[PDB]
Amino acid sequence: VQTQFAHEKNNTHEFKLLFLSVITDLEKTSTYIGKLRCARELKYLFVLYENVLVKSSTLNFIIIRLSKFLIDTQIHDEVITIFSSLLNLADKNTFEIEPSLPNLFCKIFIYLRENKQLSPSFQQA
Amino acid sequence: IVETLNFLSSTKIKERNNALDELTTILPTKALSTTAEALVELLASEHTKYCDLLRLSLSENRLSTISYVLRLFVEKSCERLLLAVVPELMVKDGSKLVDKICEYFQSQMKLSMVTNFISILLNLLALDTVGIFQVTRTITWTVIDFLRLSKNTRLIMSLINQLILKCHCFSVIDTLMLIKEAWSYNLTIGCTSNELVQDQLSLFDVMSSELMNHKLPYMIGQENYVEYREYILLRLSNYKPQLFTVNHVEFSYIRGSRDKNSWFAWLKILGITKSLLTYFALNRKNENYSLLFKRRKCDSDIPSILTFLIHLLEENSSFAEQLKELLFNGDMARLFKVCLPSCLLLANSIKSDEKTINQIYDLYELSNESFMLWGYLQYISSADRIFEWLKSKWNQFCNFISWLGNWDESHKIWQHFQEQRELDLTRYNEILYRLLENIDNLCGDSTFSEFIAAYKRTTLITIRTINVDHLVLDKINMKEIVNDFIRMQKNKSQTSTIDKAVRAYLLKQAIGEKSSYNKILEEFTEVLGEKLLCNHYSSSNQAMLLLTSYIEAIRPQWSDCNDILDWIISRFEDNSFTGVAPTVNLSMLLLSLLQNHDLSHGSIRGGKQRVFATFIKCLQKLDSSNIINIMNSISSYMAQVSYKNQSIIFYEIKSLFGPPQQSIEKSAFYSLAMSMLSLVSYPSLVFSLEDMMTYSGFNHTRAFIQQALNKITVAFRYQNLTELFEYCKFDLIMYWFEFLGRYFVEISAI
């Protein structure tokens, strides 16, 4: 946790740099392999933890960038992130919008089709 | 006591084992030695007798001379567990463990004499596909090809197993293991050869048989001909290019194949295609006394003109295919040829009704799928009429299909079907298959009619003399294809029919099975050794399967008690002495179990036990690696342990060339987070040259691009190198594939 301990010394902590880190991770595991994707999945959870800053209705990209192949080293991660995001979208102001929905649906309907194993955590979210 | 030993050997008294039973007791002294040696039904004494004749260096020399030739060599040809290890040591002395001694005999053989046995040994080597020395398993080629051309099809055929891959430069460290596995798998050479011979008849027609291996050996060496042991290497290479063994005997043998080639020869006009155009090809090579394969010989001959088989052999360098695979006015003109002919091959390659009828009528008289389907591909009413006649004339497999590929056809089928409905059982089974193949008012009517007809026709088809045999009056023939499953079960059980056994057990089934398994286990415990080695491996392999089956039963029932039974069996089986190469699966089962679960450390212990297992290296490690990789479970402790184990296998350098192959696999181990660094570290550990650069090219190719062009990881790996004494201005030059290193790692250095 030394990296976290060092990271904890967040002098001049802001917010926006998070964006760079997120887009960097998306590229890295858009390719390579499932092990890398698994590494990124853990990183994504950490990014969410790191994402202390929030702006309700202005964030939007609560999901959106999350609409990734929810399969292999991603199905559980996408679910964890989506479920966590759903909680975030319920929490406080909630700011549960909808102009991302068409794509969310494209991913939901295919990944919950395929082998047709949706899990109750989906429905609860 | 010589008289007694002779009487004891004396065969005939209970299958000639009586000599072996007497030997077991024996195991005057010289006579006793002959009696103990009889353990081989009797013929296992002559060696003892040779020592006895000498009646002491001479006795040892005599026994050894006789072991080489006195009687039958009781599992001495290729020795076929401490007794076996001792035999291997003796083998090294005899050459004057197993693998080691191999290097002594091969060498001795290369340097002097040592044909079917030698060829069989070559096949044994192919089955080996490695060696605990290599040279002792490569440098045999000299004396080899020597006595070879020095001087039936079967010996050449045995040589073929090795000849097939008589080349250098390629996926090493693993290629040897792969060659061994394939050559050993073909080891079942026999009934399969008979099947290939049957396929040859189906394929067309060439010669006897037992010649496919004889030609394959030649074809592989011929490919080579067309193309510091390294210097002598290239030397003898160019030699074999024009020097191998027995070129006159083979030339005469080739006549059978030449006859087949002549038989293979508008197509009819080609029968005299430039008389001996092929002779020009032969002359080009013979005159060269070296030639330039590629096609120079082909160029001398050839006869193109406005072939399938051509492109075929071309790429090669279905019956024929399967053989080698196992080892390792135009309408009128065409119809006339088809009527004479086969026709199906020409018709199939090509992918007018009266013309079709002339040929179909000839086919009808001959009266299968190949012709019917080849004709369907052209989709001919006149030929359809001949096809109805074909059914009349007939009075394999497919038939109706062509109908599906292409209402008169239904009517003809109905008439034939009616005739079948009218062993009748064999015809009925064929009809059912045909009906499916052709899959229509008639068909609907037929579905109902057929159900009744099949039930009626089936009777006509009509343990050893009862439980299985009672069915055999019908089943011996009825089961000979029987798409269903039941005869295979009878054949396998010996080591609907399955449904009855399943019913006998029917989670509840696991309990029934457990009781049955216990009974089998008791019998096995009682047998405790016997096969003389076969029982050992058989037990090790069976134990692996049985323990695995018991654990599987818990999973299916879930129950858990069955996994406990597996563990109890495993514990008993932990005594060691895992059956020769038979325990391989067991270790594999243990590793699989470790991955599957354990919830009690046992997985860790199982991994250690597997880690301690033997083997000519290579293979098992790879399989295990793949299996583990196919696993996620976020963490950082088990992976580290796995990495450490893999690293332990990084030392000794030299054969790093093998390590480079391992490194490509290590990198292509889903890599992910952290581990990329581990794969990079593994590469840092060894250098059979830019081996890494090649290994990295392969791993990168798996992950896109290649080696330096696919570095990326360098962002951290260069830092790992920067951290090193030489730094990034001494290592990254290779990573970049020096000033190149200093540039490639400048940030890493900072």
Numbering used by the authors:
A (entry chain A): 1270 to 1394
B (entry chain A): 6 to 32, 40 to 67, 77 to 101, 109 to 124, 159 to 176, 181 to 217, 222 to 297, 308 to 345, ...
The authors write:
ATM/Tel1 belongs to the evolutionarily conserved phosphatidylinositol-3-kinase-related protein kinase (PIKK) family. In budding yeast, Tel1 and Mec1 correspond to ATM and ATR, respectively. ATM primarily responds to DNA double-strand breaks (DSBs), whereas ATR is activated by DSBs as well as various types of DNA replication stress. Under normal cellular conditions, ATM is inactive and exists in a homodimeric form.
Besides the 4.1 Å cryo-EM structure of symmetric dimer, we also determined a 4.3 Å structure of asymmetric dimer of Tel1/ATM, which allows to trace the course of the polypeptide. We next compared the Tel1 structures of the Compact and Butterfly conformers. In the Compact Tel1, the FAT and kinase N-lobe move down by ~5–8 Å, whereas the Spiral of α-solenoid moves upwards by ~11 Å relative to their positions in the Butterfly conformer. The overall height has been reduced from 190 Å (Butterfly) to 175 Å (Compact). The kα11 and kα12 (FATC) are partially disordered, while the α4 (TRD2), α15 (TRD3) and kα9b (PRD) are almost fully disordered in the Compact conformer. As the PRD and FATC become disordered, their inhibition on the activation loop is at least partially relieved, which can now move outside of the substrate-binding groove by ~6 Å. However, the disordered fragments in the Compact monomer release these constraints, leaving sufficient space for a peptide substrate to bind. The activation loop could move outside of the substrate-binding groove to access substrates in the Compact conformer.
